[PDB]
Amino acid sequence: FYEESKPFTCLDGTATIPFDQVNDDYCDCKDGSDEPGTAACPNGSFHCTNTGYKPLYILSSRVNDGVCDCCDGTDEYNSGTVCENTCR
Ligand SMILES: [Ca+2]
Ligand SMILES: [Ca+2]
């Protein structure tokens, strides 16, 4: 058996971490590139896929803040606010 855990490198080259530190809700990269799906980095961005319509990027601090930022509502996945799809 071959152990592939080839690690993640921050898009800014500042650190190399295992992929278990990617979206682990703690900021490990100065550019925020290890936490695209959480609110952990102060300078990160969350991608609103908005399937079928124009995609948007929001501040990471708006992920699970209880406010509906993406028209698809995907920024609110564990906050208690259930967002409706308003892309149309
Ligand atoms: Ca992390
Ligand atoms: Ca939000």
From Swiss-Prot:
Q: Which residues carry this modification: Phosphoserine?
A: 60
Domain LDL-receptor class A intervals: 8-42, 40-84
- Knockout mutant characteristics: Knockout mice exhibit early embryonic lethality by 11.5 dpc. Conditional ubiquitous or kidney-specific knockdown results in polycystic liver and kidney phenotypes, respectively.
Task of the protein: Regulatory subunit of glucosidase II that cleaves sequentially the 2 innermost alpha-1,3-linked glucose residues from the Glc(2)Man(9)GlcNAc(2) oligosaccharide precursor of immature glycoproteins. Required for efficient PKD1/Polycystin-1 biogenesis and trafficking to the plasma membrane of the primary cilia.
Residues that coordinate or bind Ca(2+) 1: 21, 24, 26, 28, 34-35
Binding of substrate: at which residues?
Answer: 20, 24
| Name of this chain's protein | Glucosidase 2 subunit beta
Q: Which Cys pairs does UniProt list as disulfide-bonded?
A: 10-29, 27-41, 48-70, 68-83, 71-87
Expressed, tissue-wise, as follows: Expressed in kidney (at protein level).
Partners and quaternary state?
Heterodimer of a catalytic alpha subunit (GANAB) and a beta subunit (PRKCSH). Binds glycosylated PTPRC.
Subcellular location(s) per record: Endoplasmic reticulum
Q: Which domain of life is it from?
A: Eukaryota
Sites carrying sugar chains? 43
Q: List positions binding Ca(2+) 2.
A: 62, 65, 67, 69, 75-76
